[PDB]
Amino acid sequence: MIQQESRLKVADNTGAKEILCIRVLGGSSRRYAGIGDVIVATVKDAIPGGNVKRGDVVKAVVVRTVKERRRADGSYIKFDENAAVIIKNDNDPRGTRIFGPVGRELREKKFMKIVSLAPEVL
Amino acid sequence: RKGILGTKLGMTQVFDENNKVVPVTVVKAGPNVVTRIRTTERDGYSAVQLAYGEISPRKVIKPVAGQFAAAGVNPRRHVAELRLDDEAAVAEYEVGQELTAEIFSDGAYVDVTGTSKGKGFAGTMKRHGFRGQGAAHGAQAVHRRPGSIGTPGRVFKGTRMSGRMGNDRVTTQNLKVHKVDAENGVLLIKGAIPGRNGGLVVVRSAIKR
Amino acid sequence: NTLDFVDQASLRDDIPTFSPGDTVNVHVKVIEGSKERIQVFKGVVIRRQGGGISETFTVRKESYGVGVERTFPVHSPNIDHIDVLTRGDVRRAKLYYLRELRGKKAKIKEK
Amino acid sequence: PKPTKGPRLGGSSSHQSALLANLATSLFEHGRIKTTEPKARALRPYAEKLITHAKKGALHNRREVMKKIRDKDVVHTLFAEIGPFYADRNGGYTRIIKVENRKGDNAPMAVIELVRE
Amino acid sequence: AVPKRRMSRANTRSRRAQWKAEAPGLVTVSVAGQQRKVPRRLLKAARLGLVDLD
RNA sequence: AUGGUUUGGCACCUCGAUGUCGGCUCGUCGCAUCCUGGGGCUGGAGCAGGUCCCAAGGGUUGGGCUGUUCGCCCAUUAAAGCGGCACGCGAGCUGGGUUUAGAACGUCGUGAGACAGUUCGGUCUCUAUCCGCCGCGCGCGUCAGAAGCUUGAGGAAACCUGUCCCUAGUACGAGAGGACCGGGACGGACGAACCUCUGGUAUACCAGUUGUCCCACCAGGGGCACGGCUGGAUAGCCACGUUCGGACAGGAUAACCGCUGAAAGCAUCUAAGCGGGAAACCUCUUCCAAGACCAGGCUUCUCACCCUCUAGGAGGGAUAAGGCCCCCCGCAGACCACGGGAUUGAUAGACCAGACCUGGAAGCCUAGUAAUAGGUGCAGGGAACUGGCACUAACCGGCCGAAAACUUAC
């Protein structure tokens, strides 16, 4: 459960290390962003030599959540951190490499490229 | 519209053929005996009256025993009426006929009616979902009270203020019957049906679906 | 347990005996574009909340520097088979303290 | 046994525990005591389970009783006659008799005693 | 808040008439031979000689 | 020309007191409509708009700055409406601003001091009588006393919406672009019910452990230290959880599109008529409802016994069906009420067994110098859940509680 003013680690190689959630897209007055949700985020920490800079307003997708998320078959998946991957308007990563596992929810949300790039999908 | 009287047993878990989980509430749609026919020419409305539950013959008072004897069936604990639409619909029931669980079929949509749990004297926060006032920043003993009540200097009728909550008849619509176990007279209804375990419920074919 | 007659119909046998602490690999069938494959989840059983049909167990694993926890119903048909590798020696019924331990400190004694 | 639904007896949980232990001690010491009806109502199951421990009298059960009774003479009587006396009775070791209301505060009084039939 | 007005006699009496005590029901019992009335709540105790009868 | 939503003007109202701005909480109304709904002409090719009529059912976001309203900005959204109600709401809250006494700066004054200039600090009282409103009972009434099941006059609640997929990359369009109508799935917010799952709580549950005192001592335990502190934690309550909902259909209509045609030999959606036509209206869905005084209906049960005054009516007593009190209780509950049981009994407690929680009891033996470890042993301990079991308590018991007749018609 990620909401406004929440901080997420970046699971990409875009040079951003940490982003702050600004909005949860997907309907007015929407509250929480789970795995597979797109958020508007601002970069708080960045690699000194990276392509992105601090204070950039970007669009990211949540790939891990600390709060366990139910699945259709009654099983649950839970990670140890909230992580996001910066994307462009066409739902492709702005980076070239994804770090750490991701959830299966990225398949039904049509994030095929992120799924393919990920080391493992759970 | 079919109907039957039952009892809420509890809720459990089952899996359908796509391996998804279905949380199902178990309802004991026990045997019901038709006790009276309401006809337009006699009562002004068409309806059928069903009896359910098992009770000792020494517990029924004389008026009830007389009514059951006039019907021609042995007494039961609970009695309720099913309101049909027209005489053509009520022609298919006759007194003494027994209804069991198989009147419903798998995948059917049903309307369960029961009495909600009691919650006692409840505040506006719980009875009506009022947002509270601040817990700090100077708020003085108003952490849960409604606040304003709002020319004529009169509290208009319908004020959503605190009071007794619960214990009302509730209908849940468009519940799917996952399975109709004919051996035990048990309906497996996907979803949560009103009331506590062991309460009386009425299962009717959905009016919408 | 009044609902037992309902329960036993869907109850699933052949389930191996295991306790919190053992290391198991769970063979989980998944859907990948409408075809079948079995994805193996190997980790430590950190809890088991008895419920009969609603029995659940939790397997925790460390993968690529991030811990992952997965909760499965014990009698879920989505699990084709469970295999227990080793038996662990623990003093608790629920191993929640393992969520704060990494590597050397996160090891489990062997029975 | 079943914890009290409402507020505790002595005004706190620890006070209620001490009250119950003392009341059981007096009951086993004398055979019948007179107290307010809620106190006897709460005392019945507690004393009945202590007697159950005494019935199957082993060292383990003796220590189980001592961790509540705290009085060694009462424990000795409980494991020497009260236990063996109820050897062939399954439950219902105590009975409650309602008596006349108290004068100072109109508190309903009741007398709780061990059955000796 | 303070009463804005003095209650009339009718209203005061009508509200005051609700403050009353109900009569307990009594049943007969034989203690030491002589019959006497006792509340049914105390019947068993009277039969056991646990209530003082003046 | 409207309105008294803006500054005004009057001083009719209060100086033996009518709280002054914003904000929070909770509303209610208007339509001069922000979205959704129906339209029309387009300087409308389609898309999309422009503008305009009908339409008030629902909805109308979260933050930065400022005491702020206002306002600017940041992200969204279908949309981020305008107003009335003491510019709603301090015996509901705040006290940041304004509006006492302290102090400073600028300016004015010789000075005490002053400034619809600034700056820091600065007591917000009350046990609800009446009306009102939310809930709950007692009494009486409904032409004998009761009990089941109900009809419903009449009210209340609810009414939101997006994206994607097929039709269709077609109509139109130089192309770009881009459809109508109709089906399907998944969502956001809101609401209700529920506790199988997840998660929270846990003051009579299990285990670990610190300090100290006690149980003569060891062992094993106990009291106190926020339940001493920690790790878990079934039931109940709950949401962060589960499931369901907003309908479909009909009727009369608005703007509007029409048919059949007069006055007025033609024409005219019209003055006669007849049709279509919206989230608005009436039904439809859910709930309350016969104190609905027109006090309803269908049934079933009791369906009788005295005494007194004076025999006119009344009064009193005892009963039936039934009810209440006392009693055992409840997931029903402030009290009351409601629901169940009452020996012809499983209502509660105990007891036995299971489920579940905890996690391997005590004693003994073995190994070790000891801390401690292994066996006996899925051990011991235990609340709520389930099934058995009259062992304990529901008792040799009290109080209430049933008919004037007449008129007409058949």
UniProtKB/Swiss-Prot annotation, chain A:
User: How does the record describe its quaternary structure?
Assistant: Part of the 50S ribosomal subunit. Forms a cluster with proteins L3 and L19. In the 70S ribosome, L14 and L19 interact and together make contacts with the 16S rRNA in bridges B5 and B8.
Give the originating organism.
Answer: Mycolicibacterium smegmatis (strain ATCC 700084 / mc(2)155)
Q: What HAMAP family is this protein classified in?
A: Ribosomal_uL14
Output the superkingdom of the source species.
Bacteria
GO terms of biological process kind: translation
- What CDD domains does the record point to? Ribosomal_uL14
Q: What is this protein's name?
A: Large ribosomal subunit protein uL14
Q: Which family does it belong to?
A: Belongs to the universal ribosomal protein uL14 family.
Per the record, its GO cellular-component terms are: cytosolic large ribosomal subunit
UniProtKB/Swiss-Prot annotation, chain B:
Q: Which domain of life is it from?
A: Bacteria
- Asked if Metal-binding is a keyword of the record, the answer is no
Similarity comment: family membership: Belongs to the universal ribosomal protein uL3 family.
Q: Which InterPro entries match?
A: Ribosomal_uL3, Ribosomal_uL3_bac/org-type, Ribosomal_uL3_CS, Transl_B-barrel_sf
GO CC annotation terms, alphabetical: cytosolic large ribosomal subunit
- The protein depicted here goes by the name Large ribosomal subunit protein uL3
Summary of subunit composition and partner proteins: Part of the 50S ribosomal subunit. Forms a cluster with proteins L14 and L19.
A GO BP annotation: translation
Name the gene that codes for it: rplC
A single Gene Ontology molecular function, please? Answer: structural constituent of ribosome
- Organism encoding this protein: Mycolicibacterium smegmatis (strain ATCC 700084 / mc(2)155) (Mycobacterium smegmatis)
Q: What does this protein do?
A: One of the primary rRNA binding proteins, it binds directly near the 3'-end of the 23S rRNA, where it nucleates assembly of the 50S subunit.
Q: Where are the transmembrane segments?
A: none
Instruction: Provide the alphabetized UniProt keywords.
Output: Ribonucleoprotein, Ribosomal protein, RNA-binding, rRNA-binding
NCBIfam families in the cross-refs = L3_bact
Q: Gene3D superfamilies in the record, alphabetically?
A: 3.30.160.810, Translation factors
Curated annotation (Swiss-Prot), chain D:
GO cellular component terms listed in the entry, alphabetical order = cytosolic large ribosomal subunit
Q: Carries keyword Transport?
A: no
Gene Ontology terms for molecular function:
structural constituent of ribosome
Q: Which domain of life is it from?
A: Bacteria
Keywords (A to Z) from UniProt: Ribonucleoprotein, Ribosomal protein
Q: Please give the biological process terms from Gene Ontology that the record holds.
A: translation
UniProt lists the family membership as follows: Belongs to the bacterial ribosomal protein bL17 family.
Subunit structure, interactors included: Part of the 50S ribosomal subunit. Contacts protein L32.
Q: What is this protein called?
A: Large ribosomal subunit protein bL17
The organism of origin for this protein: Mycolicibacterium smegmatis (strain ATCC 700084 / mc(2)155)
Whichever gene encodes this chain, its name is: rplQ
Curated annotation (Swiss-Prot), chain E:
The family note in this entry says:
Belongs to the bacterial ribosomal protein bL32 family.
- This chain belongs to which protein, by name? Large ribosomal subunit protein bL32
Q: Which GO BP terms, alphabetically?
A: translation
Write out the GO MF terms. Answer: structural constituent of ribosome
Q: Where is the composition biased (Basic residues)?
A: 1-18
- Per the record, the domain of life is Bacteria
User: Looking at the keywords, is Cytoplasm present?
Assistant: no
State which gene encodes it. rpmF
Keywords per UniProt? Ribonucleoprotein, Ribosomal protein
Q: Which NCBIfam families match?
A: rpmF_bact
Q: InterPro entries under this entry?
A: Ribosomal_bL32, Ribosomal_zn-bd
**Which HAMAP family does UniProt cross-reference here?**
Ribosomal_bL32
Any one GO CC term of the record: large ribosomal subunit
Which organism does this record belong to? Mycolicibacterium smegmatis (strain ATCC 700084 / mc(2)155)
Asked if the record carries the keyword Hydrolase, the reply is no
Disordered as annotated region, ranges: 1-19
